């Protein structure tokens, strides 16, 4: 079948340069226009534009000009688009569109890649999780988490397998400038709260889960 592949997540400060690649294979390379669209979180899909797989001539959306520039390499079988002067509203997902439906006719964007997510964020973390007494109920009010963590996609959780089950991931509320990724992982057990494993904090700076100390200590 036709395989469509996007690049990984890219994060740059506003006003910087962003480059993202879209590679396609498995279709007759004569003429299959590849569409690029942008999706804001919880918003409508906005059509960025389209590119030719082999032809070369390109059309750009009437709303976005100048910063948009997509040039593909036919030999490389991939499409590259460069956007300059990043804005705050540009934080979004990018999607590619092509054709596989077997009843003919273009204008039918069949497949979509995994998309590429672009945001702006700093890096931060926290240390100790909690130092309260053991609650009477069989639950952990305080768990391994990072407070005021500006790191995007932070994963604060206990290093060991213990306390991972029964834990609801906390949303990264970003009311201030810092992303404040809470990453709450409640042990949800009275016994587990008194003796909780240290909670690692990977943060945006280090993708891998770097070890960190965060225990309920109930």
């Amino acid at each position: 079948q036709v395989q469509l592949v996007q690049s990984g997540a890219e994060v740059k400060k506003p006003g910087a340069s962003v480059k993202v690649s879209c590679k396609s294979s498995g279709y007759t390379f004569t003429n299959y226009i590849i569409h690029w669209v942008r999706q804001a979180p919880g918003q409508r899909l906005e059509w960025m534009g389209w590119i030719n797989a082999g032809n070369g001539n390109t059309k750009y959306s009437q709303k976005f000009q100048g910063r948009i520039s997509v040039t593909r390499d036919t030999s490389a079988s991939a499409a590259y688009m460069e956007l300059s002067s990043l804005k705050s509203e540009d934080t979004a997902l990018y999607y590619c569109a092509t054709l596989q439906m077997d009843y003919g006719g273009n204008g039918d964007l069949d497949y979509w890649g995994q998309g590429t997510l672009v945001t702006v964020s700093s890096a931060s973390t926290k240390g100790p999780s909690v130092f309260p007494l053991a609650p009477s109920s069989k639950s952990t009010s305080g768990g391994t988490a990072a407070l005021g963590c500006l790191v995007k996609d932070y994963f604060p959780e206990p290093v060991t397998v213990s306390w991972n089950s029964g834990a609801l991931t906390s949303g990264v509320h970003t009311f201030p400038a810092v992303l404040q990724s809470s990453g709450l992982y409640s042990l949800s057990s009275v016994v587990t709260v008194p003796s909780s494993s240290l909670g690692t904090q990977t943060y945006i700076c280090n993708v891998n889960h770097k070890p960190s100390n965060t225990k309920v200590d109930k």
């Binding site: 909690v130 130092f131 009010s141 991931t169 709450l184």
Partner: protein, 209 residues
């Protein structure tokens, strides 16, 4: 030029769901109806205004009348909760546009009252004079984004920061909002009786100063 469409619908399972996409230059163009599950790329459900691609169940159908195209679902299923879009082109036909998007839902997560659990003050936060308690709701159906931290006083806007209602894995929605308050205010307060409101209910958790 942007196509207009209702933003969300709510129809109980077993009843037909109707979505309308309208545009002035619509009768001369074909619409494509796109289905998008949350956290997933959109997928065609209707093309050429009348028929569906392979592998799409018969429950979906599309019709066109005047300047309005209608997607109709007969016997809406549980998995049909998603976002639906209409794709078309403007008068010049060289610009591709998508619809507003209708968030189709069936009737409804398991109703549950708000659960508030104030996290204990961190040792570093206490040392940094920024000891605070954060309340996270385990699960709530249609949780309201209302947080009222009341530490020895009325609700303070700066004490608690509102957060979006995330989707819980257990067929519900989990809301977790981090509340930041100074340690001096917490020390002055007799108890940090932070209250989190979700699911048309309010629960308050009080911790020692």
């Amino acid at each position: 030029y942007e196509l207009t469409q209702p933003p969300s619908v709510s129809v109980s399972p077993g009843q037909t769901a109707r979505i309308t996409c309208s545009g002035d230059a619509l009768p001369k163009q074909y619409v494509y109806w796109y289905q998008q599950k949350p956290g997933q790329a959109p997928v065609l459900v209707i093309y050429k205004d009348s028929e569906r691609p392979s592998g799409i169940p018969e429950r979906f159908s599309g019709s066109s009348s005047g300047t309005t195209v209608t997607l109709t679902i007969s016997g809406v299923q549980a998995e049909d909760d998603a976002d639906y879009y209409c794709q078309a082109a403007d008068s010049s036909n060289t610009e591709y546009v998508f619809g507003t998007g209708t968030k189709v839902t069936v009737l409804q997560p398991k109703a549950n009252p708000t659960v508030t659990l104030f996290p204990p003050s961190s040792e570093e936060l206490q040392a940094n004079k920024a000891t605070l308690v954060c309340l996270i709701s385990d699960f709530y159906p249609g949780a309201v984004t209302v947080a009222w931290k009341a530490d020895g006083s009325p609700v303070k806007a700066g004490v608690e920061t509102t957060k979006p209602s995330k989707q819980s894995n257990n067929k519900y929605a989990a809301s977790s909002y981090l509340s930041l308050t100074p340690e001096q205010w917490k020390s002055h307060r007799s108890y940090s009786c932070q209250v989190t409101h979700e699911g048309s209910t309010v629960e308050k958790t009080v911790a020692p100063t």
